[PDB]
Design a protein around this ligand. Sequence first.
Ligand SMILES: COc1ccncc1CC(=O)N1CC[C@H](C(N)=O)C1
Ligand SMILES: [Zn+2]
Length: 139
Amino acid sequence: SGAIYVGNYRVVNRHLATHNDWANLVWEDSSRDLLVSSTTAQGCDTIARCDCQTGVYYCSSRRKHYPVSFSKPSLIFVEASEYYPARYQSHLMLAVGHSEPGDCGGILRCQHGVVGIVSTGGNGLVGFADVRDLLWLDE
Ligand SMILES: COc1ccncc1CC(=O)N1CC[C@H](C(N)=O)C1
Ligand SMILES: [Zn+2]
């Protein structure tokens, strides 16, 4: 679990969005596994605006932050799970690292700020849903 809190927005994995997030929906995209809902309070996370390919992510299944190298956002085949059938997920970045289903929501950060959140993984990989292209998160 986990979310990014920037301005009056809350960014979560779409598959983990609550019925309360859908009522307060701003934008969602099933192909990216993202949902953004509006908040009453102002958030303080800064979104990165960069092309960094190294960063640090939080892994809740190890209670540890790990440094990683990750691929640029791309269209990647993601195996079936209880939340989606087997499909291509867009704007996804992969790294070699540990992840379990419940690690979704953990933040990936670089020197510039938040890059994205854990969204996919298994078999020694971890995938992150990029948020750096969502320029409107800053307004
Ligand atoms: C961190 O994800 C995992 C880690 C280990 N085995 C499996 C997984 C993958 C997983 O459970 N999901 C839930 C839906 C999500 C998606 N974006 O399609 C992928
Ligand atoms: Zn960066």
